[PDB]
Design a binder for this molecule. Structure first.
Ligand SMILES: [Cl-]
Ligand SMILES: [Cl-]
Lengths: 429, 428
């Protein structure tokens, strides 16, 4: 196409050979009457030299950072040079010239806030660091599906535009839909249960949306959700599935993203099996005993997760068995105590990465649960009806991709992970 | 847990052994004082028989179709039975009791109305033919990504809510987005072009939406769209890749989806490399060479395509070099310009994929927008990025559901998509 080799394809064993590189002008320096071009392509950064008496010298002088070029030259081994080589330019073609100067420095280090970078997001995304994020995410999805296929999970796609919400109180985006006010789904919840009720084992990785104005970290309005629903399984089963998933994920990043982690100065945690389980009951007591005003039944906020993290000597733990009263109507209660529920959160340090549970499967227990939350059963008929015709016991979870990315990169901002973030003040690009 | 084995695991070399099945009561019949239960699960259909001398008998008497049960029994080989085995039940546990009668038959050759089936979609989808389709789509997706991984492609996700349209005059769904009227995207277009401009090779498989009120077949309002964008490629490179993808999908379906194709009575077309490339220009000349009322520059539609399917004796084929003015502003015109570097992939009479090489110069994008009679200033959110080194690139978008017709032979999009969405369909 526009090249014979990617930069990284060339080894010292290429000395004296003619190669064609293509890519971006990363840097441009002049030393000793020689022009040095650091070129960038998807494999990384090479070094090209244009000496005075080359025919490429003339055009090399008009080149600017982020212009796209083709360069044909002869490989020279060196060892003082990147990966032990450099390209001695003979011919350079200008494919696409960039305006100068740049509004954002692709090699300058992070200057300006998030919002200034989002005006020049492409230039920002081109930075080694962001490139590494984009790469790791892709590997993370591959490893996610791989584990699932091994367990015979079937990949699915459920409706994103829905008539009414599954959990009232959740704020959904209005969609004007052929004359009706419909909404954007917040999760595939009902549909994946349904599809579990037909082919048993299903996942979906896909967009979801939430309309709140919460300004805390990690609360984009649009977000990718990684969902799994498993028939003839309860919450302990799926927790063990996820363990294996997460393990294959970090293992893939560690082997296939060695270089990316290097650019990131980051080492994802070990996934020890089993992951520490801590009952919610016990979490409440650790908190109380350190002096926080927290009663059984209360939520466990970020501030609490910090102390929980600071106390467990574990970065990666499940919080299992929450109060039934704080979990959806579709979540199975504990048999030995109705006040508790067969649910879990997976926390990484102080961030929630996954939530799941064992679900209900009888219409009557579902209908009771709805009453126990003061909802009108007749208004969830769209959910209840399917359970008249043999819904099996099932269990599932949802993990947030970009939250999982924090565990895989070290980046502490979701707007730094998602290449085109959406929230209350952010719609473009 | 609930089972010890799936129905398809158990073979004759299991004789005398105890086995736990979990599944759905597909069929009940009584014969010779003996109860017959056709059990179903994700692997398929199995035969359980309950003797009158069994303790499982009494609960066996109250089972209804589609109930979820657990049957502990012993395997006996028979070779008159499915997979040469059946299960003589010792205990039966009732997990989920289903109401009687069923409003839709799972065991039946169910000739019912579409909206009637939508009303009871879970039962509908449990038919072997539907499970087939579901399973094949999964296999298709895996194969698709597998090919793209081999070539270095990176999986992206692009924004679904957007400020404004890319194709003007295209109808998008309004979203009320923090006080503003935003829209659902109809494709990742701009965004996958921008991602290719950072890491060269990308793909995305994700929902898109159009809001037109069509009444023609294969025009769901929400659809899963498989996109690929590739820097330093032109359309011919991306068509080659497309072929390589479709080849692998067909192979994977034929090898891994054997029983599914069996249930469906269907054989996928052969992806013959290279797939026929029919120049638009020649497509018009053929349509004229038989008796038709078409001129160069006119659109080729479904009538015209049924006709092309015949004339070409090829079921899979590209129509290429469409008139530049029938094509988006971001599609690059041919070097030698009334024509553009564009293609559509066709299966018989149905458009499956479209793509092209893209423009990458601000100037030519602006011009293209003037010559279509649009005002560049309104498209500034597209143009701006091309100021800072967008490389040559190209790409395509393939409808998952339309692909699916090629893989299954099913002629209705609402028989492929589990929970379809259109002007008169929102629930389920
Ligand atoms: Cl909801
Ligand atoms: Cl658009």
């Amino acid at each position: 196409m526009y090249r014979s080799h990617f930069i990284a394809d060339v080894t010292p064993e290429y000395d004296g050979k003619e190669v064609i590189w293509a890519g971006w002008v990363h840097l441009l320096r002049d030393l000793g009457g020689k022009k040095f071009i650091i070129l960038r392509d998807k494999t990384g950064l090479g070094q090209v030299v244009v000496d005075k008496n080359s025919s490429a010298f003339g055009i090399s002088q008009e080149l600017t950072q982020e212009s796209v070029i083709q360069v044909r030259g002869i490989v020279k081994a060196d060892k003082r040079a990147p990966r032990g080589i450099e390209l001695h330019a003979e011919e350079i073609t200008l494919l696409s010239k960039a305006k100068a100067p740049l509004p954002l420095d692709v090699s300058g280090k992070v200057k300006a806030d998030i919002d200034t970078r989002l005006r020049e997001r492409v230039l920002d995304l081109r930075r080694q660091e962001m490139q590494a994020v984009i790469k790791i995410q892709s590997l993370a999805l591959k490893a996610f599906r791989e584990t699932l296929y091994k367990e015979g999970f079937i990949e699915i796609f459920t409706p994103k535009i829905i008539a009414s919400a599954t959990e009232g109180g959740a704020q959904l985006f209005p969609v004007i839909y052929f004359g009706k006010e419909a909404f954007l789904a917040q999760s595939p919840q009902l549909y994946k249960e349904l599809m579990a009720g037909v082919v048993e084992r299903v996942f979906e990785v896909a967009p979801a949306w939430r309309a709140e104005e919460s300004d805390t970290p990690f609360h984009l309005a649009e977000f990718i959700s990684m969902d799994v629903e498993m028939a003839f399984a309860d919450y302990n089963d799926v927790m063990q599935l996820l363990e294996k998933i997460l393990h294959n994920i970090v293992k893939t990043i560690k082997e296939e993203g060695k270089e990316e982690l290097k650019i990131l100065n980051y080492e994802p945690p070990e996934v020890k099996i089993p992951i520490k389980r801590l009952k919610y009951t016990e979490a409440i007591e650790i908190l109380r005993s350190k002096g926080y005003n927290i009663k059984f039944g209360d939520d466990i906020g970020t501030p609490e997760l910090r102390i929980l993290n600071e106390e467990l000597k574990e970065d990666l733990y499940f919080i299992v068995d929450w109060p039934s009263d704080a979990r959806p109507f579709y979540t199975k209660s504990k048999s030995e105590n109705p006040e508790l529920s067969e649910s879990f959160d997976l926390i990484y340090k102080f961030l929630e990465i996954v939530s799941g549970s064992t679900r209900n499967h009888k219409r009557e227990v579902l209908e009771e649960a709805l009453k126990k939350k003061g909802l009108k059963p007749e208004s969830f008929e769209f959910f209840l009806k399917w359970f008249d015709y043999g819904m099996p016991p099932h269990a599932g979870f949802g993990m947030g991709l970009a939250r999982l990315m924090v565990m895989l990169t070290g980046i502490q901002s979701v707007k730094e992970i998602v290449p085109f973030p959406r929230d209350k003040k952010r719609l473009t690009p």
